Amino acid sequence: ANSFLEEVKQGNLERECLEEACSLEEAREVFEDAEQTDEFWSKYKDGDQCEGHPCLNQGHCKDGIGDYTCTCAEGFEGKNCEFSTR
């Protein structure tokens, strides 16, 4: 029966089902969250969260399918931390 899932310890959530192994079979039911199904897939394209990196001045991005965030250094502030104090 099948070949990918089953023999595997179990399905997954995105990477394991986001390759030539799976597309959205079991991983679809392995979510539980309603909003986690939409934005998540619905043409999994989004902005690759951190593609253009929303964080400036060497900030950092956690990124997460759907939306991302940013973290700046101590001497940095502003929405995109685009402002360097010193």
Coordinates of all heavy atoms in Angstrom, one line a residue, unseen atoms left out:
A1 N 0.9 -1.2 0.0 CA 0.0 0.0 0.0 C 0.9 1.3 0.0 O 1.7 1.4 0.8 CB -0.9 0.0 1.2
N2 N 0.7 2.1 -0.9 CA 1.5 3.4 -1.0 C 3.0 3.0 -0.9 O 3.4 1.9 -1.1 CB 1.1 4.3 0.2 CG -0.2 4.9 0.0 OD1 -1.2 4.4 0.4 ND2 -0.3 6.1 -0.7
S3 N 3.8 4.0 -0.7 CA 5.3 3.7 -0.7 C 6.0 4.7 0.2 O 6.9 4.4 0.9 CB 5.9 3.7 -2.1 OG 5.0 3.1 -3.0
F4 N 5.6 6.0 0.1 CA 6.2 7.0 0.9 C 5.8 6.9 2.4 O 6.4 6.3 3.2 CB 5.9 8.4 0.4 CG 6.4 9.5 1.3 CD1 7.7 9.5 1.7 CD2 5.5 10.4 1.8 CE1 8.2 10.5 2.6 CE2 6.0 11.4 2.7 CZ 7.3 11.4 3.1
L5 N 4.6 7.5 2.7 CA 4.1 7.4 4.1 C 3.9 5.9 4.5 O 4.2 5.0 3.7 CB 2.7 8.1 4.2 CG 1.8 7.8 3.0 CD1 2.0 8.7 1.8 CD2 2.0 6.3 2.5
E6 N 3.5 5.7 5.7 CA 3.3 4.3 6.2 C 4.6 3.7 6.6 O 4.9 3.6 7.8 CB 2.7 3.4 5.1 CG 1.9 2.3 5.7
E7 N 5.5 3.4 5.7 CA 6.8 2.8 6.0 C 7.6 3.9 6.8 O 8.5 3.6 7.5 CB 7.5 2.4 4.8 CG 7.4 0.9 4.5
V8 N 7.2 5.1 6.6 CA 7.9 6.2 7.3 C 7.4 6.3 8.7 O 6.3 6.0 9.0 CB 7.7 7.5 6.6 CG1 8.1 7.3 5.1 CG2 6.2 7.9 6.7
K9 N 8.2 6.7 9.7 CA 7.8 6.8 11.1 C 6.4 7.5 11.1 O 5.6 7.2 12.0 CB 8.8 7.7 11.9 CG 10.1 6.8 12.1 CD 10.0 6.2 13.5 CE 9.9 7.2 14.6 NZ 11.2 7.3 15.3
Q10 N 6.1 8.3 10.2 CA 4.8 9.0 10.1 C 4.9 10.1 9.1 O 5.9 10.4 8.4 CB 4.5 9.7 11.5 CG 3.4 8.9 12.1 CD 3.3 9.3 13.6 OE1 4.2 8.9 14.4 NE2 2.3 10.0 14.1
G11 N 3.8 10.8 8.8 CA 3.8 11.9 7.8 C 4.7 13.0 8.2 O 5.8 12.8 8.6
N12 N 4.2 14.3 8.2 CA 5.1 15.4 8.6 C 4.2 16.7 8.6 O 3.2 16.7 9.2 CB 6.2 15.6 7.5 CG 7.4 16.4 8.2 OD1 7.9 15.9 9.2 ND2 7.8 17.5 7.7
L13 N 4.7 17.8 8.0 CA 3.9 19.0 8.1 C 4.2 19.9 6.9 O 3.3 20.6 6.4 CB 4.2 19.8 9.4 CG 3.2 21.0 9.5 CD1 1.9 20.5 10.2 CD2 3.9 22.1 10.4
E14 N 5.4 19.9 6.4 CA 5.7 20.8 5.2 C 6.8 20.2 4.4 O 6.7 19.8 3.2 CB 6.0 22.2 5.7 CG 5.6 23.2 4.6
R15 N 8.0 20.2 4.9 CA 9.2 19.8 4.2 C 9.0 18.3 3.6 O 9.1 18.1 2.5 CB 10.4 19.8 5.1 CG 10.3 20.9 6.1 CD 11.7 21.6 6.3 NE 12.6 20.7 7.1 CZ 13.9 20.9 7.1 NH1 14.4 21.9 6.4 NH2 14.7 20.1 7.7
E16 N 8.8 17.4 4.5 CA 8.7 16.0 4.0 C 7.5 15.9 3.0 O 7.6 15.1 2.1 CB 8.4 15.1 5.2 CG 9.6 14.3 5.6
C17 N 6.5 16.6 3.2 CA 5.4 16.5 2.2 C 5.5 17.5 1.1 O 4.8 17.6 0.1 CB 4.1 16.8 2.9 SG 3.1 15.2 2.9
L18 N 6.5 18.3 1.2 CA 6.7 19.4 0.2 C 7.9 19.0 -0.8 O 8.8 19.8 -1.1 CB 7.1 20.7 0.9 CG 7.2 21.9 -0.1 CD1 8.7 22.2 -0.4 CD2 6.6 21.5 -1.5
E19 N 7.9 17.7 -1.2 CA 9.0 17.3 -2.1 C 8.4 16.3 -3.1 O 7.3 16.2 -3.4 CB 10.1 16.7 -1.3 CG 11.5 17.2 -1.8
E20 N 9.3 15.5 -3.7 CA 8.8 14.5 -4.7 C 8.2 13.3 -4.0 O 7.9 12.3 -4.6 CB 10.0 14.0 -5.6 CG 10.5 15.2 -6.4
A21 N 8.2 13.4 -2.7 CA 7.6 12.3 -1.9 C 6.1 12.5 -1.6 O 5.3 11.6 -1.7 CB 8.3 12.2 -0.5
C22 N 5.8 13.7 -1.3 CA 4.3 14.0 -1.1 C 4.0 15.4 -1.5 O 4.9 16.2 -1.7 CB 4.1 13.8 0.4 SG 2.7 14.8 1.0
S23 N 2.8 15.8 -1.7 CA 2.4 17.1 -2.1 C 1.4 17.7 -1.1 O 1.5 18.8 -0.7 CB 1.7 17.1 -3.5 OG 2.2 18.2 -4.3
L24 N 0.4 16.9 -0.7 CA -0.6 17.4 0.3 C -1.6 16.2 0.6 O -2.7 16.4 0.8 CB -1.4 18.6 -0.3 CG -1.6 18.3 -1.8 CD1 -3.1 18.4 -2.1 CD2 -0.9 19.4 -2.6
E25 N -1.1 15.0 0.6 CA -2.0 13.9 0.9 C -2.2 13.8 2.4 O -3.1 14.4 3.0 CB -1.3 12.6 0.5 CG -1.2 12.6 -1.1
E26 N -1.4 13.0 3.1 CA -1.6 12.9 4.6 C -1.3 14.3 5.3 O -2.1 14.7 6.1 CB -0.6 11.9 5.2 CG -1.3 10.5 5.3
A27 N -0.2 14.9 5.0 CA 0.1 16.2 5.6 C -1.1 17.1 5.7 O -1.3 17.9 6.6 CB 1.2 16.9 4.8
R28 N -2.0 17.0 4.7 CA -3.3 17.9 4.7 C -4.1 17.6 6.0 O -4.5 18.5 6.7 CB -4.1 17.6 3.5 CG -5.1 16.4 3.7 CD -5.9 16.2 2.5 NE -6.6 14.9 2.6 CZ -7.6 14.6 1.8 NH1 -7.9 15.4 0.8 NH2 -8.3 13.5 1.9
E29 N -4.3 16.3 6.3 CA -5.1 16.0 7.5 C -4.2 16.1 8.8 O -4.7 16.1 9.9 CB -5.6 14.5 7.4 CG -6.7 14.5 6.3
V30 N -2.9 16.1 8.6 CA -2.0 16.2 9.7 C -1.7 17.7 10.1 O -0.6 18.1 10.2 CB -0.6 15.6 9.4 CG1 0.2 15.3 10.7 CG2 -0.9 14.2 8.8
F31 N -2.8 18.5 10.2 CA -2.6 19.9 10.5 C -3.5 20.2 11.7 O -3.0 20.7 12.8 CB -3.1 20.8 9.3 CG -1.9 21.2 8.6 CD1 -0.9 20.3 8.2 CD2 -1.7 22.6 8.2 CE1 0.3 20.7 7.5 CE2 -0.6 23.0 7.5 CZ 0.4 22.1 7.1
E32 N -4.8 20.0 11.6 CA -5.7 20.2 12.8 C -6.1 21.7 12.8 O -7.3 22.1 13.0 CB -5.1 19.9 14.1 CG -6.0 19.0 14.9
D33 N -5.2 22.6 12.5 CA -5.6 24.1 12.5 C -6.3 24.4 11.2 O -5.9 24.0 10.1 CB -4.3 24.9 12.6 CG -3.9 25.1 14.1 OD1 -4.6 24.5 14.9 OD2 -3.0 25.8 14.3
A34 N -7.3 25.2 11.3 CA -8.0 25.6 10.1 C -7.2 26.6 9.3 O -7.0 26.5 8.1 CB -9.4 26.2 10.4
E35 N -6.8 27.7 10.0 CA -6.0 28.7 9.3 C -4.7 28.2 8.9 O -4.0 28.7 8.1 CB -5.9 29.9 10.2 CG -6.9 31.0 9.9
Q36 N -4.3 27.1 9.5 CA -2.9 26.5 9.2 C -3.0 25.8 7.9 O -2.0 25.5 7.3 CB -2.5 25.5 10.3 CG -1.1 25.1 10.1 CD -0.3 25.3 11.4 OE1 -0.8 25.9 12.4 NE2 1.0 24.9 11.5
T37 N -4.2 25.4 7.4 CA -4.3 24.7 6.1 C -4.3 25.8 5.0 O -3.6 25.6 4.0 CB -5.6 24.0 6.1 OG1 -6.7 24.8 6.3 CG2 -5.6 22.9 7.2
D38 N -5.1 26.8 5.1 CA -5.2 27.8 4.0 C -3.8 28.5 3.8 O -3.0 27.9 3.1 CB -6.2 28.9 4.5 CG -7.6 28.4 4.1 OD1 -7.8 27.6 3.3 OD2 -8.6 29.0 4.7
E39 N -3.6 29.6 4.3 CA -2.3 30.4 4.1 C -1.2 29.4 3.8 O -0.5 29.4 2.9 CB -2.0 31.2 5.3 CG -3.0 32.4 5.5
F40 N -1.0 28.4 4.8 CA 0.1 27.4 4.6 C 0.2 27.0 3.1 O 1.0 27.4 2.4 CB -0.3 26.3 5.5 CG 0.3 24.9 5.0 CD1 1.6 24.6 5.0 CD2 -0.7 24.0 4.5 CE1 2.1 23.4 4.5 CE2 -0.2 22.8 4.0 CZ 1.1 22.5 4.0
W41 N -0.7 26.2 2.7 CA -0.7 25.8 1.2 C -1.3 26.8 0.4 O -0.7 27.8 0.0 CB -1.3 24.4 1.0 CG -0.3 23.4 0.7 CD1 -0.5 22.3 -0.1 CD2 1.1 23.3 1.1 NE1 0.7 21.6 -0.2 CE2 1.7 22.2 0.5 CE3 1.9 24.2 1.9 CZ2 3.0 21.9 0.7 CZ3 3.3 23.8 2.1 CH2 3.8 22.7 1.5
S42 N -2.6 26.6 0.0 CA -3.3 27.5 -0.9 C -2.3 28.1 -1.9 O -2.2 29.3 -2.0 CB -3.9 28.7 -0.1 OG -5.2 29.0 -0.6
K43 N -1.6 27.3 -2.6 CA -0.6 27.7 -3.6 C 0.7 28.2 -2.8 O 1.1 29.3 -2.9 CB -1.1 28.9 -4.3 CG -0.4 29.0 -5.7 CD -1.3 29.7 -6.7 CE -0.7 29.6 -8.1 NZ 0.8 29.9 -8.0
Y44 N 1.2 27.3 -2.0 CA 2.4 27.5 -1.1 C 3.4 28.4 -1.9 O 4.4 27.9 -2.5 CB 3.0 26.2 -0.7 CG 4.4 26.5 0.0 CD1 4.5 27.6 0.8 CD2 5.4 25.6 -0.2 CE1 5.7 27.8 1.4 CE2 6.7 25.8 0.4 CZ 6.8 26.9 1.2 OH 8.0 27.2 1.9
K45 N 3.2 29.6 -1.9 CA 4.1 30.5 -2.7 C 4.5 31.7 -1.7 O 5.7 32.0 -1.5 CB 3.4 31.0 -3.9 CG 3.3 32.6 -4.0 CD 4.3 33.0 -5.2 CE 5.4 33.9 -4.6 NZ 6.5 33.9 -5.5
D46 N 3.6 32.3 -1.1 CA 3.8 33.4 -0.1 C 5.1 34.2 -0.5 O 5.4 34.3 -1.7 CB 4.0 32.8 1.3 CG 5.3 32.1 1.4 OD1 5.5 31.1 0.6 OD2 6.2 32.4 2.2
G47 N 5.8 34.8 0.4 CA 7.0 35.6 0.1 C 8.2 34.8 0.6 O 9.3 35.3 0.8
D48 N 8.1 33.5 0.7 CA 9.3 32.7 1.2 C 9.8 33.3 2.5 O 10.9 33.0 2.9 CB 10.4 32.7 0.1 CG 11.1 31.4 0.1 OD1 10.5 30.4 0.5 OD2 12.2 31.4 -0.4
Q49 N 9.0 34.0 3.2 CA 9.3 34.7 4.5 C 10.8 34.8 4.6 O 11.5 33.9 5.0 CB 8.8 33.9 5.6 CG 7.3 34.1 5.8 CD 6.5 33.2 4.8 OE1 6.9 32.1 4.5 NE2 5.4 33.7 4.3
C50 N 11.3 36.0 4.4 CA 12.8 36.3 4.5 C 13.5 36.2 3.2 O 14.7 36.2 3.1 CB 13.4 35.3 5.5 SG 14.9 36.1 6.2
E51 N 12.7 36.2 2.1 CA 13.3 36.2 0.8 C 14.0 37.5 0.6 O 15.2 37.6 0.4 CB 12.2 36.0 -0.3 CG 12.1 37.2 -1.3 CD 11.3 36.8 -2.5 OE1 10.7 35.7 -2.5 OE2 11.3 37.5 -3.5
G52 N 13.3 38.6 0.7 CA 13.9 39.9 0.6 C 14.3 40.3 2.0 O 14.8 41.4 2.2
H53 N 14.2 39.5 2.9 CA 14.6 39.8 4.3 C 14.0 41.1 4.8 O 14.5 42.2 4.4 CB 16.1 39.9 4.4 CG 16.7 38.5 4.4 ND1 17.2 37.8 5.5 CD2 16.9 37.6 3.3 CE1 17.6 36.6 5.1 NE2 17.5 36.4 3.8
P54 N 12.9 41.0 5.6 CA 12.2 42.2 6.1 C 13.1 42.9 7.1 O 12.8 44.0 7.5 CB 11.0 41.7 6.8 CG 11.1 40.2 6.9 CD 12.3 39.8 6.0
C55 N 14.2 42.3 7.6 CA 15.0 42.9 8.6 C 16.2 43.6 8.0 O 17.0 43.1 7.2 CB 15.5 41.8 9.5 SG 14.4 40.4 9.5
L56 N 16.4 44.8 8.4 CA 17.6 45.6 7.8 C 18.7 45.7 8.8 O 18.6 45.2 9.9 CB 17.0 47.0 7.6 CG 15.8 46.9 6.7 CD1 15.5 48.3 6.3 CD2 16.1 46.0 5.5
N57 N 19.8 46.3 8.5 CA 21.0 46.5 9.4 C 21.4 45.1 10.0 O 21.7 45.1 11.1 CB 20.6 47.4 10.5 CG 20.4 48.8 9.9 OD1 21.2 49.7 9.9 ND2 19.2 49.1 9.2
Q58 N 21.5 44.1 9.2 CA 22.0 42.8 9.8 C 21.0 42.2 10.8 O 21.4 41.4 11.6 CB 23.3 43.2 10.5 CG 24.4 42.1 10.1 CD 24.5 42.0 8.6 OE1 25.0 42.9 8.0 NE2 24.1 41.0 8.0
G59 N 19.8 42.6 10.7 CA 18.8 42.1 11.7 C 18.7 40.6 11.6 O 19.7 39.9 11.2
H60 N 17.6 40.0 11.8 CA 17.4 38.5 11.7 C 16.0 38.2 11.4 O 15.1 38.9 11.7 CB 17.9 37.9 13.0 CG 19.1 37.0 12.8 ND1 19.0 35.8 12.1 CD2 20.4 37.2 13.2 CE1 20.2 35.3 12.1 NE2 21.1 36.1 12.7
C61 N 15.7 37.1 10.8 CA 14.3 36.7 10.5 C 14.0 35.3 10.9 O 14.7 34.3 10.6 CB 14.1 36.8 9.0 SG 14.9 35.5 8.1
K62 N 12.9 35.1 11.6 CA 12.6 33.7 12.1 C 11.9 33.0 10.9 O 12.0 31.8 10.6 CB 11.6 33.7 13.3 CG 12.3 34.3 14.5 CD 11.7 35.7 14.8 CE 12.6 36.4 15.9 NZ 11.7 36.7 17.0
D63 N 11.1 33.8 10.1 CA 10.4 33.2 9.0 C 9.5 32.1 9.3 O 9.8 31.3 10.2 CB 11.4 32.8 7.9 CG 11.6 31.3 7.9 OD1 10.9 30.6 7.2 OD2 12.5 30.8 8.6
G64 N 8.4 32.0 8.7 CA 7.4 30.9 8.9 C 6.3 30.9 7.8 O 5.6 31.8 7.6
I65 N 6.2 29.8 7.1 CA 5.2 29.7 6.0 C 3.9 30.5 6.4 O 3.2 30.1 7.3 CB 4.9 28.2 5.7 CG1 6.1 27.6 5.1 CG2 3.7 28.1 4.8 CD1 6.8 26.7 6.1
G66 N 3.7 31.5 5.7 CA 2.4 32.3 6.0 C 2.9 33.8 6.3 O 2.4 34.7 5.7
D67 N 3.7 33.9 7.3 CA 4.2 35.3 7.6 C 5.5 35.2 8.4 O 5.9 34.2 8.9 CB 3.1 36.0 8.5 CG 2.1 35.0 9.1 OD1 2.5 34.4 10.1 OD2 1.1 34.9 8.6
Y68 N 6.2 36.3 8.5 CA 7.5 36.2 9.2 C 7.7 37.4 10.1 O 6.7 38.2 10.4 CB 8.6 36.2 8.2 CG 8.5 37.3 7.2 CD1 7.7 38.4 7.3 CD2 9.3 37.3 6.1 CE1 7.6 39.4 6.3 CE2 9.3 38.3 5.1 CZ 8.4 39.3 5.2 OH 8.3 40.3 4.2
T69 N 8.9 37.6 10.7 CA 9.1 38.8 11.6 C 10.5 39.2 11.5 O 11.2 38.9 10.5 CB 8.9 38.3 13.0 OG1 8.7 36.9 13.1 CG2 7.6 38.9 13.6
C70 N 11.0 40.1 12.4 CA 12.4 40.6 12.2 C 13.0 40.9 13.6 O 12.2 41.3 14.5 CB 12.4 41.8 11.3 SG 12.5 41.3 9.6
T71 N 14.3 40.9 13.7 CA 14.9 41.3 15.0 C 16.2 42.1 14.7 O 17.0 41.7 13.9 CB 15.3 40.0 15.7 OG1 14.4 39.7 16.8 CG2 16.7 40.1 16.3
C72 N 16.3 43.2 15.3 CA 17.5 44.1 15.0 C 18.5 44.0 16.1 O 18.3 43.4 17.1 CB 17.1 45.6 14.8 SG 15.3 45.8 15.1
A73 N 19.6 44.7 16.0 CA 20.7 44.7 17.0 C 20.4 45.7 18.1 O 19.3 46.3 18.1 CB 22.0 45.0 16.4
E74 N 21.2 45.9 19.0 CA 21.0 46.8 20.1 C 21.0 48.3 19.6 O 20.1 49.1 20.0 CB 22.1 46.7 21.2 CG 22.0 47.8 22.2 CD 20.6 47.8 22.9 OE1 19.6 47.9 22.2 OE2 20.6 47.6 24.1
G75 N 21.9 48.6 18.8 CA 22.0 50.0 18.3 C 21.2 50.1 17.0 O 21.5 50.8 16.1
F76 N 20.0 49.5 17.0 CA 19.2 49.7 15.8 C 17.7 49.8 16.2 O 17.3 49.2 17.2 CB 19.4 48.4 14.9 CG 20.8 48.5 14.3 CD1 21.8 47.9 15.0 CD2 21.0 49.1 13.1 CE1 23.1 48.0 14.5 CE2 22.3 49.1 12.5 CZ 23.4 48.6 13.2
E77 N 16.9 50.5 15.5 CA 15.5 50.6 15.9 C 14.6 51.0 14.7 O 15.1 51.2 13.6 CB 15.3 51.7 17.0 CG 15.7 53.1 16.4 CD 14.7 54.1 17.0 OE1 14.6 54.1 18.2 OE2 14.2 54.9 16.3
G78 N 13.3 51.1 14.8 CA 12.5 51.5 13.7 C 11.7 50.2 13.2 O 12.0 49.1 13.6
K79 N 10.7 50.4 12.4 CA 10.0 49.2 11.9 C 11.0 48.2 11.3 O 11.2 47.1 11.8 CB 9.0 49.6 10.8 CG 8.4 48.4 10.1 CD 7.5 47.7 11.1 CE 6.1 48.3 11.2 NZ 5.7 48.4 12.6
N80 N 11.6 48.6 10.2 CA 12.6 47.6 9.6 C 13.9 47.9 10.2 O 15.0 47.6 9.6 CB 12.7 48.0 8.1 CG 11.4 47.7 7.3 OD1 11.2 46.5 7.1 ND2 10.6 48.6 7.0
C81 N 14.0 48.4 11.4 CA 15.3 48.6 12.1 C 16.2 49.3 11.1 O 17.4 49.2 11.1 CB 15.9 47.2 12.5 SG 14.6 46.2 13.2
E82 N 15.6 50.0 10.2 CA 16.4 50.7 9.1 C 17.1 51.9 9.7 O 17.7 52.7 9.0 CB 15.4 51.2 8.0 CG 16.3 51.7 6.8 CD 15.3 51.9 5.6 OE1 15.1 50.9 4.9 OE2 14.9 53.0 5.4
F83 N 17.0 52.1 11.0 CA 17.6 53.3 11.6 C 18.7 52.8 12.6 O 18.5 52.1 13.5 CB 16.6 54.1 12.4 CG 15.5 54.5 11.4 CD1 14.2 54.8 11.9 CD2 15.8 54.6 10.0 CE1 13.2 55.1 10.9 CE2 14.8 55.0 9.1 CZ 13.5 55.2 9.6
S84 N 19.9 53.3 12.3 CA 21.0 52.9 13.2 C 21.3 54.0 14.2 O 21.5 55.2 13.8 CB 22.3 52.7 12.3 OG 21.9 52.4 11.0
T85 N 21.3 53.7 15.4 CA 21.5 54.8 16.4 C 22.9 55.3 16.3 O 23.1 56.5 16.1 CB 21.3 54.2 17.8 OG1 22.5 53.5 18.2 CG2 20.1 53.3 17.8
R86 N 23.9 54.5 16.4 CA 25.3 54.9 16.3 C 26.0 54.2 15.1 O 25.9 53.0 15.0 CB 26.1 54.6 17.6 CG 26.4 53.1 17.6 CD 26.8 52.7 19.0 NE 28.3 52.7 19.1 CZ 29.0 52.0 18.2 NH1 28.4 51.2 17.4 NH2 30.3 52.1 18.3

